[PDB]
């Protein structure tokens, strides 16, 4: 997260860290046994780490659970990043409490202007690389489809939305991928892509979760 702030230990209880010997992607806990992330985060040997703040020190409240199966959306396209969504089933159900809780799926899509909270352990620099120990947060509004498509001509599908600041300086970045975009207590987006990080006129692009509610529910029910 570039230009964000330190969230505060366990203040984003649904935030998950995907680990394979190091943090590589974020995710959101949607129930005691399922996590939603980005399809581009797919990898074998994924350990889901819940209740994390400092990802390098064991501070208490952490729950490490192996992924039993990762389900990449069947229509995911690695070049366009259309349908960039993946469901991860935990080997065992997480112990939900004050510091580890699930986030609700939306019943309707969010409109332009809606303020949302984006979080992650991704790169904190626009030019260069600097990964944080603790979780970073950023409040950003959903942009209009017009501005989104003007920024990324021919690359925005109906399953994507832009969020952020056109003036640059505040944005999600590499490492934040798969993480949550929560608006009014509902998970509306998943960190997907963008051109660089926190660049002028190049806001972040996110997977539009409201378009996948039926798919998520049907898939979870059959697995
Ligand atoms: C051809 C096309 N339709 N496109 C262009 C490529 C685009 O996908 C991608 C895929 C990867 C990349 C980056 C890596 C990267 C990864 C995660 C990111 C997460 C967030 C942000 C952001 N600025 N919000 C930027 C990121 C940049 C990189 O430079 O390797 C950039 C665009 C999909 C859309
Ligand atoms: Ca740690």
Q: Strand order across the biggest sheet?
A: 1-9-8-11-12-13-10
Tally of separate domains: 2
Biggest sheet character:
7 strands, antiparallel
The value of Rg in angstroms is 16 Å
State the CATH superfamily name of the largest domain.
Trypsin-like serine proteases
CATH topology group of the largest domain: Thrombin, subunit H
The portion of residues assigned to helices is under 10%
The small molecules bound here are: the ligand CC(=N)N1CCC(Oc2ccc([C@@H](Cc3ccc4ccc(C(=N)N)cc4c3)C(=O)O)cc2)CC1, calcium ion
Explain this structure.
Substrate binds at residues 171-172, 174-175, 177. It is found in: Secreted, Extracellular space. InterPro entries: Peptidase_S1_PA, Peptidase_S1_PA_chymotrypsin, Peptidase_S1A, Serine_Proteases_S1, Trypsin_dom, TRYPSIN_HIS, TRYPSIN_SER. The chain is mainly β and 223 residues long. The chain folds into two domains: 1-12 and 103-210, Trypsin-like serine proteases (Thrombin, subunit H), CATH 2.40.10; 13-102 and 211-223, Thrombin, subunit H (Beta Barrel). It is built from two helices and 13 strands; from the N terminus they run E-E-E-E-E-E-E-E-E-H-E-E-E-E-H. The strands form two sheets. It has a seven-stranded antiparallel β-sheet. A six-stranded antiparallel beta barrel has the order 2-3-4-7-6-5. The longest helix has 9 residues, at 213-221. It is globular, with a radius of gyration of 16 Å. The chain binds ligand BX3 and calcium ion. The site of the ligand CC(=N)N1CCC(Oc2ccc([C@@H](Cc3ccc4ccc(C(=N)N)cc4c3)C(=O)O)cc2)CC1 has 15 residues, from strand 12.
């Amino acid at each position: 997260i570039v230009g964000g702030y330190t969230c505060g230990a366990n203040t984003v209880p649904y935030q998950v860290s995907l680990n394979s010997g190091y943090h590589f992607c974020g995710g959101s806990l949607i129930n005691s046994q399922w996590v939603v992330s980005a399809a581009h985060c797919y990898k074998s040997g994924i350990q889901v780490r819940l209740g994390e703040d400092n990802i390098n020190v064991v501070e208490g409240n952490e729950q490490f659970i192996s992924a039993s199966k990762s389900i990449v959306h069947p229509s995911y396209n690695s070049n366009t990043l259309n349908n960039d969504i993946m469901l991860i089933k935990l080997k065992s159900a997480a112990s939900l409490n004050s510091r580890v809780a699930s986030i609700s799926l939306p019943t309707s899509c969010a409109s332009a202007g809606t303020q949302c909270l984006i979080s992650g352990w991704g790169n904190t620099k626009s030019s260069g690389t600097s990964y944080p120990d603790v979780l970073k947060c950023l409040k950003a509004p959903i942009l209009s489809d017009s501005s989104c498509k003007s920024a990324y001509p021919g690359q925005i599908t109906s399953n994507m939305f832009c969020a952020g600041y056109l003036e640059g300086g505040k944005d999600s970045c590499q490492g934040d991928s798969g993480g949550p975009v929560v608006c009014s207590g509902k998970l509306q987006g998943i960190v997907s892509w963008g051109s660089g990080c926190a660049q002028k006129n190049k806001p972040g692009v996110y997977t539009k979760v409201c378009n996948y509610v039926s798919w998520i529910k049907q898939t979870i029910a059959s697995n």
